[PDB]
Design an enzyme around this catalytic site. Structure first.
Site, PDB file in Angstrom:
ATOM      1  N   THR A   1      31.952  40.023  39.706  1.00 11.20           N
ATOM      2  CA  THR A   1      33.196  40.789  39.713  1.00 11.20           C
ATOM      3  C   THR A   1      33.164  41.813  40.842  1.00 11.20           C
ATOM      4  OG1 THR A   1      34.660  42.284  38.482  1.00 11.20           O
ATOM      5  CG2 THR A   1      32.368  42.466  37.965  1.00 11.20           C
ATOM      6  N   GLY A   2      34.261  41.890  41.585  1.00 10.20           N
ATOM      7  CA  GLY A   2      34.409  42.908  42.603  1.00 10.20           C
ATOM      8  C   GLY A   2      35.098  44.154  42.075  1.00 10.20           C
TER       9      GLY A   2
ATOM     10  N   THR B   1      39.974  32.932  30.978  1.00  6.50           N
ATOM     11  CA  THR B   1      41.276  32.794  31.632  1.00  6.50           C
ATOM     12  C   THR B   1      41.419  31.390  32.187  1.00  6.50           C
ATOM     13  OG1 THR B   1      40.464  33.514  33.802  1.00  6.50           O
ATOM     14  CG2 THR B   1      41.177  35.214  32.347  1.00  6.50           C
ATOM     15  N   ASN B   2      42.585  31.104  32.748  1.00  7.42           N
ATOM     16  CA  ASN B   2      42.869  29.766  33.257  1.00  7.42           C
ATOM     17  C   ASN B   2      42.080  29.360  34.514  1.00  7.42           C
ATOM     18  OD1 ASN B   2      44.432  28.279  31.392  1.00  7.42           O
ATOM     19  ND2 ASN B   2      46.311  29.407  31.936  1.00  7.42           N
TER      20      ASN B   2
ATOM     21  N   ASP C   1      57.757  27.863  40.324  1.00  5.91           N
ATOM     22  CA  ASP C   1      56.480  27.340  39.849  1.00  5.91           C
ATOM     23  C   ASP C   1      56.302  25.927  40.404  1.00  5.91           C
ATOM     24  OD1 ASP C   1      54.458  28.498  37.520  1.00  5.91           O
ATOM     25  OD2 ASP C   1      54.370  26.359  37.574  1.00  5.91           O
TER      26      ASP C   1
ATOM     27  N   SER D   1      42.660  43.923  40.073  1.00  3.61           N
ATOM     28  CA  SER D   1      42.390  43.055  38.930  1.00  3.61           C
ATOM     29  C   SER D   1      42.633  43.822  37.613  1.00  3.61           C
ATOM     30  CB  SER D   1      40.955  42.554  38.987  1.00  3.61           C
ATOM     31  OG  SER D   1      40.040  43.617  38.813  1.00  3.61           O
ATOM     32  N   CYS D   2      42.702  43.085  36.505  1.00  6.41           N
ATOM     33  CA  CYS D   2      42.736  43.688  35.174  1.00  6.41           C
ATOM     34  C   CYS D   2      41.537  44.600  34.999  1.00  6.41           C
ATOM     35  CB  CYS D   2      42.898  42.584  34.112  1.00  6.41           C
ATOM     36  SG  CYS D   2      41.870  41.250  34.249  1.00  6.41           S
TER      37      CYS D   2
ATOM     38  N   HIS E   1      34.754  39.831  28.587  1.00  8.11           N
ATOM     39  CA  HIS E   1      36.116  39.515  29.019  1.00  8.11           C
ATOM     40  C   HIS E   1      36.533  38.173  28.435  1.00  8.11           C
ATOM     41  CE1 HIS E   1      39.453  38.771  31.715  1.00  8.11           C
ATOM     42  NE2 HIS E   1      39.197  39.837  32.456  1.00  8.11           N
TER      43      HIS E   1
ATOM     44  N   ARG F   1      31.389  29.267  35.895  1.00  8.01           N
ATOM     45  CA  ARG F   1      32.762  29.040  35.438  1.00  8.01           C
ATOM     46  C   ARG F   1      33.063  27.552  35.253  1.00  8.01           C
ATOM     47  NH1 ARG F   1      37.303  33.580  37.067  1.00  8.01           N
ATOM     48  NH2 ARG F   1      35.847  35.338  37.144  1.00  8.01           N
TER      49      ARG F   1
ATOM     50  N   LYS G   1      56.475  24.093  46.241  1.00  8.69           N
ATOM     51  CA  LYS G   1      55.030  24.278  46.398  1.00  8.69           C
ATOM     52  C   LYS G   1      54.667  25.224  47.543  1.00  8.69           C
TER      53      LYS G   1
END
Ligand SMILES: NC(=O)c1ccc[n+]([C@@H]2O[C@H](COP(=O)([O-])OP(=O)(O)OC[C@H]3O[C@@H](n4cnc5c(N)ncnc54)[C@H](O)[C@@H]3O)[C@@H](O)[C@H]2O)c1
Ligand SMILES: NC(=O)c1ccc[n+]([C@@H]2O[C@H](COP(=O)([O-])OP(=O)(O)OC[C@H]3O[C@@H](n4cnc5c(N)ncnc54)[C@H](O)[C@@H]3O)[C@@H](O)[C@H]2O)c1
Ligand SMILES: NC(=O)c1ccc[n+]([C@@H]2O[C@H](COP(=O)([O-])OP(=O)(O)OC[C@H]3O[C@@H](n4cnc5c(N)ncnc54)[C@H](O)[C@@H]3O)[C@@H](O)[C@H]2O)c1
Ligand SMILES: NC(=O)c1ccc[n+]([C@@H]2O[C@H](COP(=O)([O-])OP(=O)(O)OC[C@H]3O[C@@H](n4cnc5c(N)ncnc54)[C@H](O)[C@@H]3O)[C@@H](O)[C@H]2O)c1
Lengths: 330, 330, 330, 330
Positions: free
Chosen positions: B207-208, B179-180, B31, B148-149, B176, B194, B75
């Site tokens: 959304t795709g 999200t972050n 991370d 995606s979800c 939905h 957003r 990174k």
């Protein structure tokens, strides 16, 4: 000399709205994004809603009510062309240049004065309007802090308590709306509490605001501290002060002193209400500190006072006040 | 080959929880933060709550139920030493390496396979478990996307509708959780919607996922599109599909087909309920798509079907499933 | 004697979950709604999620793991036939029979003991487990209050502070999740503060919880008061106690006293942590009071202590403890 | 005839604000609470904020900018003294008298017209302003429904689509702020979905709004249905309409038809924007239906149109418009 804003964020945009509404011309706005985005964020605000006027843009300018304002995306403050735009006073509202050694970069671009919209390190002076703004010396004070929203909420109340009763010592908590320093969902952060999902938590976090009140009221040095609890509201906060006074008092006596101050010497800074209000009622209130009289408690010399504040709009009004003071003094 | 995770975020951490519970060894987590912070985030989760086990750390490792896992903050993915940790399959869950040209950097460090936990650009193949996982070919497919979800929520339902009834065309909306990628308060973002305060708004966004569904189920090419609305919940989502079918149907017939699939060929992927549930009831459900039968509507050949999904937990279970498929195939 | 519940609400249902898990038989549940709805609410919980077992119903019973529980909708407590179900101890959790003269209606139906899950008026005794449960006298104490969630959070800490240091006086605030007494949107209410939209406000409201702590710790009579601030979280609260002690102390000494009590005589009632936690981490914690050690402050003899509590689950665990004590004593 | 309000709730109070700003005199307000509370709720609003004028009260009246308005707490409509206050038009906004048989009780108090601010049963006519207000006949229509907020959002769009392209059939979802019918925390409710905690859930619930659109646009009878998803916002909603048209169209043609209608015949009812807006941007917008042009999709003859609406303010403006129409017609 004209005014500039570095960091057109929550504070920068509200300070702009306020200065614009007062006829104080901002000549350059700098951020990290394009002018379409700056215009869009000014026009539509999730709290204060539609900008009350016209907003347009091109690659070089924002146009607000027909006034052209240079708008740029220069990451390094040393390179912002303040001089070319005629800017002498810079509002430093990015959040990343609160060290005076970094904020002084604006002077390289031709600024004469920098107002840091936050607690600072190495500043020439920290000012809380209504409490120590008379200490401002235009010949010596060039990098200036306007303190935090919480310090601006505390200092007016503590001034009144000290002058009317005397303060032996005090502790406080601020129950505070989340801000952009926080995280929407759990995510790495230097502060492991602020790492956590902001809108579904109460989040304790360290605050220097009570200690910092000693900068403007030296009698509180070493005897005032506190804590913040960040909660799921988008703006609006309340300070909960527990003070040990130098004599026994009633709640009514404390309230009367705060009311007298609000109606007199601290008018426009400290407000006083006896209405049974909630957070939404203080959104867009211009005061630093709004005493909620029905909440005051006293057990002899130990008292509890609550003061609301819109951490965005109230604080932004103080930044604007300080800008006008700096301009007035030359 | 062992498994590695790049991006120990909302998805990375849930995938870790799931793999750990299945006995699949993760040998390296990478991370941008220190191991104290990674351990803390794993231990305390605002949604799924306390990690069911012991978490400890030092400068080089996380320790989970005693087991050492190399933990780093590199990174640049080209510099992660996957090979030295014995890692052959990398879960790419940072959100910043969804372009396969960047995700391929993991192969430089000695990984053999990369699973991008998102829609990708330039990937070898995109897989939705239960729908086209048999298309995965270990001799051809090395950088793969798990979609995606939302795509994982749609495809199982669309498969059933296509196979049972035939789909002429369809449009959908997903309502939905935030999200972050979103913003806590209004702040610059490449997507001007957003950019806006996430927990006090309904936020339309492109959304795709419907077009992506029309590729894993290629018969729907050019016949499926939709939209997303982000709302103030922290996890959990619902897809609202409106389909024109190739014959007249009833709601009951549609529900029966979905129930049959859920109970048989799509068991573990598609679920079916007739209970009167709300979002909190599907949090931590491992399914991709949970049909809410009482919401189904039909007007002749035009139907409306709703399917819940926990966009974190459900999707993370699919990533884990894909990881186990990739390991099984060699 | 068996146990009955009147008011199958937030507290009534969690108390049921806890008693059921402990093997304590509840033989009658009474509310104002039908058994389908009681079963549905037990099965699906927005905070604690799916009931860990099977739930069914008919017109006369709830069925939990196959065990029949009589379930009725009788608005007047004088008409509930407790004795016919074998019930001798009633948990009075409706919120509307906290006056003892009203709670005594359960005695008409043959109950022997009533535990009011709230502050009461005219009760035989108010008990906070861990603080004064040894004062319970089964021969004379039949209408018993278990106090408020907040009083249960305060009394363990105040006991420790008095015993280790001496308490001269104290004030507190609880920052508290909203509850069903409040309003979702602005709507008439006897309390003009609680009239306001609960999930988009900080709402000050009066609390008797500090004064009521004197019921179980008489040394605090006339020397303890406070306030509540209701905030937009669905469960979980924190008490912020500012106490004037009888000697100078350090934060370390205060924390050590609380830790010693948590690990010893107050184990299971008072907890102590040094982790950097937030609200979601204490949801479903069974303790009355969870000291957050890193938040402790001291200025000479004035201290500040924070204790978390899940106002539903923690309190429900205390109700269950009190039920078991009453049963044990006869 | 003067105007009266029964039910000074979310709708009743906004309708009052709007009529007041238009110079339409309201002569009596009835609710179930005291005038202190009515004044307080008018003065301070969690959404629309401080009433723009002075508000005062006594036992018998509210006073708004000095003007006396009779204010009572009479639970039975038959007993409200409309005749003494000169009231001929009653706004029926309690939510409990939507059946015309019960609403007709206002007429025996001396009223001549009743506008039910909701779908009704047994009413003389249901009106959506801009769609069928010309059908209002003052000699025959006594008890009038202004339909639901959602129907007012849908009908203007459906009128345009039918007139420009022809509508075969359609389905919709409204993603809708929670309202006072809902529960703050899980609590018994006739609707087991609406029983659930509103501010931490997406909650599916039945809506009659699409079916009810056939009352004002009969061509849609048996050809229009939908669903609601209640989400954690306090006001503001969006309708997501999927329509099958009688020819193939593009999104550009659909948007052009909606723009033409908004700028022409449906001005003030239907609005049209191409800005990238979110919920907070439509709070306090007076339109019934606000087309978000960038969201429009078309696949041949199947189209998707999103229309925002402030379910409080927009709808309240329609109630005010209908009141003014009824007054003008005698
Ligand atoms: N929000 C509050 O309640 C509040 C109150 C008082 C003081 N403050 C302080 O004001 C400052 C700004 O806070 P905010 O809430 O407006 O933050 P924010 O995150 O909303 O805004 C910061 C802005 O600065 C811009 N920025 C960042 N780096 C930059 C750079 N190098 N050059 C130019 N622009 C840059 C960002 O793009 C953003 O638009 C902080 O110091 C904060 O502590 C905030
Ligand atoms: N959250 C959801 O619902 C969801 C569902 C399906 C897919 N996804 C996708 O999964 C991916 C991750 O999403 P998330 O919600 O977990 O995001 P997140 O922001 O919670 O986590 C991202 C993690 O990546 C780390 N990171 C960023 N840059 C890095 C770098 N260069 N090297 C190493 N680590 C880095 C961050 O520190 C963070 O911990 C995204 O592509 C997202 O679109 C998210
Ligand atoms: N929620 C908390 O945090 C909390 C904590 C401690 C104590 N309490 C106290 O516990 C009591 C219940 O609180 P709650 O939050 O569970 O409330 P709630 O509103 O969730 O539940 C109350 C239940 O009582 C039922 N009820 C009402 N009148 C009834 C009657 N006449 N007969 C039978 N049933 C009736 C209602 O239908 C509802 O199911 C209150 O006294 C409250 O002050 C609440
Ligand atoms: N809120 C919306 O978005 C919305 C939109 C369109 C229509 N409506 C409809 O308008 C009506 C009111 O909705 P609301 O949201 O204003 O509700 P609300 O609950 O906020 O207000 C209802 C008011 O009616 C009062 N009341 C109840 N019974 C009464 C009685 N017998 N006599 C006098 N007053 C009584 C209550 O005290 C309360 O002040 C409902 O029919 C609702 O469906 C609501």
């Amino acid at each position: 000399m004209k005014v500039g804003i570095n960091g057109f964020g929550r504070i920068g945009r509200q300070v702009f709205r306020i200065l614009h509404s007062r006829g104080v011309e901002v000549a350059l706005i700098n951020d990290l994004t394009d002018n379409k985005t700056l215009a869009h964020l000014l026009k539509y605000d999730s709290i204060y809603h539609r900008f009350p006027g016209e907003v347009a843009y091109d690659d070089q300018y924002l146009y607000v009510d027909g006034k052209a304002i240079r708008a740029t995306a220069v990451k390094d403050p040393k390179e912002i062309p303040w001089a070319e735009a005629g800017v002498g006073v810079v509002i430093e509202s990015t959040g990343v240049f609160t060290d005076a050694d970094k904020a002084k970069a604006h002077l390289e671009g031709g600024a004469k004065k920098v107002i840091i919209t936050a607690p600072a390190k190495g500043e020439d002076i920290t000012i809380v309007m209504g409490v120590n703004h008379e200490a401002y010396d235009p010949s010596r004070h060039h990098i200036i802090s306007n303190a935090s929203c919480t310090t601006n909420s505390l200092a007016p109340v503590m001034k009144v308590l000290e002058e009317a009763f005397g303060v032996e010592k005090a502790l406080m908590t601020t129950v505070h709306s989340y801000t952009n320093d926080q995280r929407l969902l759990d995510l790495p952060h230097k502060d492991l509490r602020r790492a956590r999902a902001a809108a579904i938590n109460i989040i304790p976090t360290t605050t220097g605001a009570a200690k910092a009140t000693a900068l403007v009221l030296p009698s509180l040095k070493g005897r005032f501290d506190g804590m913040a609890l960040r909660v799921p509201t988008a703006t609006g906060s309340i300070s909960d002060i527990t003070a040990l006074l130098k004599r026994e008092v009633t709640a009514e006596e404390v309230n009367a002193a705060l009311k007298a101050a609000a109606e007199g010497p601290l008018k426009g800074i400290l407000a006083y209400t006896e209405d049974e209000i909630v957070l939404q009622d203080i959104v867009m209130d211009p005061h630093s500190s709004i005493v909620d009289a029905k909440l005051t408690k006293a057990l002899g010399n130990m008292v509890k006072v609550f003061a609301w504040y819109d951490n965005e709009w109230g604080y932004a009004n103080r930044v604007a006040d300080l800008v006008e003071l700096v301009l007035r003094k030359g």
